[PDB]
Design a protein around this ligand. Structure first.
Ligand SMILES: COc1ccc(-n2cc(-c3ccc(S(N)(=O)=O)s3)nn2)cc1
Ligand SMILES: [Zn+2]
Length: 251
């Protein structure tokens, strides 16, 4: 499978033609305030430098594999372990976030993918309700170099070629996410690439993460994908809510 062309995604996986897919256009005026949504909790995200982590150009994204012991909770009794994180981005002067807000697309987006503690493996969780949970934050331009992102972005030259990888020291993974874990949107949807399995709990932070212009350019200008083609604009088209109500942790 690829972005922007064949094969048709439902031929690869019929789940890609489901009614309840991601990503979506978040319309905050249509979101339901749900006071039961408490601040997200993370434990073990501040890693020692060793062991190192794998950072991979898989031709569709740059993906950081996370080690065991990164615990995440959506609330009391809703417990997850982090598997990996990756990015979606645009091109020079074009945004490439997956989620949009009132039709606005942001420069880029981070996804931190988690597996329910009720499942031993990802493949057992696919398609099961709440089996997988993704934390999502938009990346925008700020005035400063973001030092957490710099740890990954300074290594993209090493993995420019499709299918390459490198090892990076552990870092504070939570520093790749916004500081505000209280204010977010949450809805049920799908993986945004094949196999597009439904049952995925999406949490999208209100607060954005700030990267420098140079950083955003490094992200969109360094990696190469399938063919002799640049790895850019690696986001799925917006999927309709189709009657799903997005929840908000704030009125
Ligand atoms: C069969 O074993 C499998 C092992 C891993 C996966 N797997 C797919 C994915 C993802 C695909 C797309 C996303 S996303 N963009 O966060 O929604 S995460 N994460 N793990 C799927 C199957
Ligand atoms: Zn993603």
């Amino acid at each position: 499978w690829r972005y922007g062309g064949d094969p048709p995604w439902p031929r690869v996986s019929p789940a890609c033609a489901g009614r309840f897919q991601s990503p979506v256009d978040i319309r905050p005026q249509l979101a339901a305030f749900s006071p039961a949504l408490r601040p997200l909790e993370l434990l073990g995200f501040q890693l020692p430098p060793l062991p190192e982590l794998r950072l991979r150009n898989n031709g569709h994204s740059v993906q950081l594999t996370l080690p065991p012991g990164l615990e995440m909770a959506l609330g009391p009794g809703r417990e997850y372990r982090a598997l990996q994180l990756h990015l979606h981005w645009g091109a020079a002067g074009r945004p490439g976030s997956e989620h949009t807000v009132e039709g606005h697309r942001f420069p880029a987006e981070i996804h931190v993918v988690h597996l329910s503690t009720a499942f031993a493996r990802v493949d057992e969780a696919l398609g099961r309700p709440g089996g997988l949970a993704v934390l999502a934050a938009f990346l925008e331009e700020g005035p400063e170099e973001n030092s957490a992102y710099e740890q990954l972005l300074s290594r993209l030259e090493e993995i420019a070629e499709e299918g390459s990888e490198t090892q990076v020291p552990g870092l504070d993974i939570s520093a790749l996410l916004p500081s505000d874990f209280s204010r977010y949107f949450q809805y049920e949807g799908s993986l945004t690439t094949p196999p597009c399995a439904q049952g995925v709990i999406w949490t999208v932070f209100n607060q954005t993460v700030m990267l420098s212009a140079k950083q955003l350019h490094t992200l969109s200008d360094t990696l190469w994908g399938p063919g002799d083609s640049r790895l850019q604009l690696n986001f799925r088209a917006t999927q309709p809510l189709n009657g799903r109500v997005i929840e908000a942790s704030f009125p």
